[PDB]
Amino acid sequence: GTTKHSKLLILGSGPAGYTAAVYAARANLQPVLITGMEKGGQLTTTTEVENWPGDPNDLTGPLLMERMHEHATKFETEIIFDHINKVDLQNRPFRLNGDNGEYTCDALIIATGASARYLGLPSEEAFKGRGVSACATSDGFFYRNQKVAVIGGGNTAVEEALYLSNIASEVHLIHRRDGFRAEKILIKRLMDKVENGNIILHTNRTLEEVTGDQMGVTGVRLRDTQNSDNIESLDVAGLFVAIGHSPNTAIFEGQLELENGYIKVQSGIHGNATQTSIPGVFAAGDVMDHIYRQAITSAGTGCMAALDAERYLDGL
Amino acid sequence: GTTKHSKLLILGSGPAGYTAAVYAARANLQPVLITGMEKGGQLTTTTEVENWPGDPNDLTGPLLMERMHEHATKFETEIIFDHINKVDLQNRPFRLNGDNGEYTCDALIIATGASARYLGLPSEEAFKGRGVSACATSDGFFYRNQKVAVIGGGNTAVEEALYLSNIASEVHLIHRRDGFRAEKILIKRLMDKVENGNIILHTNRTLEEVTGDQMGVTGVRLRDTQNSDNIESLDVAGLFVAIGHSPNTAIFEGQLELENGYIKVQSGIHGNATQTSIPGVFAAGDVMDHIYRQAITSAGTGCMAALDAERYLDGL
Ligand SMILES: Cc1cc2nc3c(=O)[nH]c(=O)nc-3n(C[C@H](O)[C@H](O)[C@H](O)COP(=O)(O)OP(=O)(O)OC[C@H]3O[C@@H](n4cnc5c(N)ncnc54)[C@H](O)[C@@H]3O)c2cc1C
Ligand SMILES: Cc1cc2nc3c(=O)[nH]c(=O)nc-3n(C[C@H](O)[C@H](O)[C@H](O)COP(=O)(O)OP(=O)(O)OC[C@H]3O[C@@H](n4cnc5c(N)ncnc54)[C@H](O)[C@@H]3O)c2cc1C
Ligand SMILES: NC(=O)c1ccc[n+]([C@@H]2O[C@H](COP(=O)([O-])OP(=O)(O)OC[C@H]3O[C@@H](n4cnc5c(N)ncnc54)[C@H](OP(=O)(O)O)[C@@H]3O)[C@@H](O)[C@H]2O)c1
Ligand SMILES: NC(=O)c1ccc[n+]([C@@H]2O[C@H](COP(=O)([O-])OP(=O)(O)OC[C@H]3O[C@@H](n4cnc5c(N)ncnc54)[C@H](OP(=O)(O)O)[C@@H]3O)[C@@H](O)[C@H]2O)c1
């Protein structure tokens, strides 16, 4: 087994990992980046992106990530295709174990993301990128003045429904239970939009099937109530499955301070804002952000992490 | 005199203001953006940009900003060419007075930047974008393994010198006084690089002239010492004038909490991170960031500000 030492190691090949790589390479730090299993991150699972600033037309998630990969390799970032399964952050240098070897480093940037879960239905899988989506902030504007459905019961779903009711003609919130398990302020605003507006509630329903045509989604079939099998049918142009994200942080449990699985950073306006609870370990992207979750905020913290890492490595 | 009300008003047409505009427009908020006098921000004063992620080749600051302008107008952002001279943020709606009218709004995003100062020399003005620069993080990699000069005595200059000594073969720090007025940790690391390395000190000198050829800077002439007129000459490929930035916040004094002229935001990992001391007023870009100062971090906080503004406007 091999053991490669690097001054700076970056975990993840999403927008945060690639931006941290171009900033680290241009700081002459010679970064090594480990891609993980999903080479290019969550953006490779989507079709059109029209909120990456400065790219008004013709951008897709795959094309953005190919450009970011080109950018990192232009400045000679060593890119390694591997995935980390064990970590030891309590001894110096930090040791990380992959499938293809052992890695040690003096500074670490963690940009392992927070992947969206789906329902697992074949009909849902069929319409991904053509009507079924997992990000309302990104894709909500394509369904402006149209009917939309959101499925879920926690915080994300009530937030997605609330955000979407300002864009769509109406929002259909679908949930298995007869009650939402979201924050008190979210549920208050939800019930105001149910009563005086835009959101139609469909509690005690489960999604059976996503129907549609050649261009995409046209409807949704629901079933059940509290004791019965009624089977509803909704005419809808888009579906937003909002059942939660999975921050890829299991490997860091007991090593780093986490908050609902998200890596806690120092934050603040006085620098060293991406530093985790361990000196020399920094986090960027969706793994440390459960509020905004965009490629542009992930690239922004990717940049901050590389400059924090540079300042750490130089004794400041 | 006219008084135009807008639900959301954005101040500034740099990367933070334009990204907040595309996120606000795609949230169906119908943003109005006031450009200020410098239409396109600080990036219009630079030549090549090769740290905007996903753009490996052929980007210049003017081209990025033209693309961001196209992006904002594609989503029907109302762009107004005006500059704000007076503000009243203590009454609702917020009132802002420009040269071309009065504006009121329910939520405000301030993205007015922090402009770099220069020495005012004709020879320096002659070589801007071709050897004279004000951002070491951005432009430092172009002078890799070459001789570089930095001029200044505060925090920025010692930081720029320290950052540049890892890229350049040697750094020549030029200062009027016989001592630097930077942080204790910065001066410690500085004196270590002076003694065991890369940084050559030139205290009690003032820059007289920046010389160069058709392609750019080739030298620098200094003069004086503590009582005498010796006149030095340095062979150098780049000059970094690091004499300070000017956050455009005079209009907000006594209205908002400032910290060395920078707008203080809430920050943190629990949302509403761009909110200033006044509810409903948010800040983004270099006006609230004195540490990273990049177009990508400005676009990231621009995005955060628009989503914070959306959540505020919807009672969350
Ligand atoms: C359906 C959908 C559409 C979206 N559309 C948009 C859009 O239009 N615009 C937008 O702004 N945002 C969009 N987003 C959000 C965007 O995808 C994420 O914000 C962004 O990808 C997060 O960047 P990241 O670098 O933090 O993580 P990710 O892109 O999630 O990348 C994480 C990386 O870490 C690696 N990794 C994980 N575990 C390990 C490990 N143990 N060892 C090593 N590497 C590991 C992975 O392989 C991957 O490369 C969308 C999201 C979804 C799900
Ligand atoms: C020489 C140089 C080169 C640089 N190169 C790079 C680079 O290669 N890459 C990089 O990442 N960064 C670079 N930067 C840094 C980058 O320019 C800034 O980080 C970025 O422009 C800040 O964005 P912003 O939107 O916060 O503010 P700015 O771009 O500074 O824009 C501020 C806006 O606010 C407006 N405004 C000001 N006052 C008022 C008012 N009272 N009313 C209304 N509007 C007002 C202005 O007109 C302007 O449109 C460089 C900076 C300099 C100086
Ligand atoms: N603090 C905040 O403001 C905030 C905001 C956004 C995100 N976050 C973070 O992001 C994480 C994930 O967001 P979340 O809370 O929405 O995820 P979550 O905690 O998993 O809640 C989503 C819920 O959707 C329901 N569901 C699952 N499968 C379903 C199906 N087939 N049909 C219908 N309903 C189904 C489940 O609730 P039931 O068991 O009730 O059915 C599930 O728990 C959070 O845990 C948090 O860390 C926090
Ligand atoms: N907290 C931090 O870590 C940090 C870091 C970066 C930036 N910042 C922020 O950014 C602001 C600006 O940075 P700064 O401190 O460098 O600016 P500054 O406070 O203006 O200091 C720069 C100094 O350069 C000197 N100078 C001016 N003209 C010169 C010339 N012609 N030749 C040589 N020297 C000349 C002056 O010092 P003399 O009077 O001594 O000659 C001047 O005060 C700060 O005030 C702060 O708000 C803070």
Confirm or deny that A17 is annotated as ligand binding: no
Q: Helix, strand or coil for residue A112?
A: coil
Residue at B77: amino acid letter: T
- Distance from A259 to chain B by nearest Cα, in Å? 10
Rounded to whole angstroms, the Cα distance separating B164 from A25 reads: 13
Cα pseudo-dihedral A88, A93, A95, A100, rounded to 10: 170
Nearest residue by C-alpha to atom 34 in ligand 4: B152
Per-residue HEC secondary structure of chain B comes to CCEEEEEEEEECCCHHHHHHHHHHHCCCCCCEEECCCCCCCHHHHCCECCCCCCCCCCCEHHHHHHHHHHHHHHCCCEEECCCEEEEECCCCCEEEEECCCEEEEEEEEECCCEEECCCCCHHHHHCECCCEECCHHHHHHHHCCCEEEEECCCHHHHHHHHHHCCCCCEEEEEECCCCCCCCHHHHHHHHHHHHCCCEEEEECCEEEEEEECCCCEEEEEEECECCECCCEEEECCEEEECCCEEECCHHHCCCCCEECCEECCCCCCCCCCCECCCCCEEECHHHCCCCCCCHHHHHHHHHHHHHHHHHHHCCC
Which residue of B18, B23, B28, B143 is the best one to mutate when testing the A interface, meaning the one whose CB has the most A CBs within 10 A? B28
A15 vs B271: CB contact, 8 Å cut-off? Answer: no
Return the biggest CA–CA distance within chain B: 67
Return the structure tokens found at B31: 């943003």
A144 vs B289: CB contact, 8 Å cut-off? Answer: no
Residue at B21: amino acid letter: A
- Experimental technique, in short, is X-ray
Q: Which of B22, B28, B29 sits opposite A53 (nearest CB)?
A: B22
Write the CA distances from A239 to A139, A221, B131, integer angstroms: 10, 12, 53
CATH class of the region B1-116+245-315: alpha beta
Contact A222, A174 (CB under 8 A): yes
CB within 8 Å of B122: residues ≥ 6 apart: none
Does residue B50 belong to the interface with chain A, where contact is any CB pair within 8 Å?
Answer: yes
Q: Helix, strand or coil for residue A221?
A: strand
Strands A217-223 and A206-212 come out as antiparallel
User: How many residues in total does chain B contain?
Assistant: 316
User: How many residues in total does chain A contain?
Assistant: 316
Other Cβ atoms within 10 Å of B63 Cβ, number: 17
Q: Which ligand is nearest to the CA of A287?
A: 1
Same fold for the domain at B1-116+245-315 and the one at B117-244? yes
Rounded to whole angstroms, the Cα distance separating A18 from A32 reads: 11
Contact A218, A233 (CB under 8 A): no
Q: Which residues are registered as beta bridge partners of B201?
A: B173
Backbone phi, then psi, for A70, in 5-degree steps? -60, -40
Residue A204 exposure: Cα atoms within 13 Å on the Cβ side: 9
Name the residue ranges covered by the structural domains of chain A: 1-116+245-315, 117-244
Rounded to whole angstroms, the Cα distance separating B38 from A41 reads: 37
Residue B6 Cβ inside 6 Å of ligand 2? The answer reads: no
Q: Which of B55, B259, B296 sits opposite A300 (nearest CB)?
A: B296
Q: Which ligand is nearest to the CA of B156?
A: 4
Return the structure tokens found at A168: 């769509």
Contact B108, B281 (CB under 8 A): yes
Rounded to whole angstroms, the Cα distance separating A83 from A98 reads: 6
Positive or negative torsion for Cα A79, A80, A81, A82: negative
Q: Which ligand is nearest to the CA of B140?
A: 2
Q: Which of B162, B186, B314 sits opposite A162 (nearest CB)?
A: B314
Which residue numbers of B belong to the known binding site for FAD?
A: 35-42, 286-295
Reported as type and span, the H/E element at residue A189 is: helix A184-195
Q: Å resolution of this model?
A: 2.3
Return the structure tokens found at B40: 């396109």
- Nearest alpha carbon to residue A89 among A111, A109, A71: A109
Does residue B282 belong to the interface with chain A, where contact is any CB pair within 8 Å?
Answer: no
Does residue A145 belong to the interface with chain B, where contact is any CB pair within 8 Å?
Answer: no
CB within 8 Å of B35: residues ≥ 6 apart: B12, B13, B79, B80, B81, B82, B83
Domain B117-244 homologous superfamily, CATH: FAD/NAD(P)-binding domain (3.50.50.60)
B307 vs A57: CB contact, 8 Å cut-off? Answer: no
A54 vs B52: CB contact, 8 Å cut-off? Answer: yes
- Nearest alpha carbon to residue B114 among B78, B81, B156, B154: B156
Reported as type and span, the H/E element at residue A53 is: none
Rounded to whole angstroms, the Cα distance separating B69 from B79 reads: 9
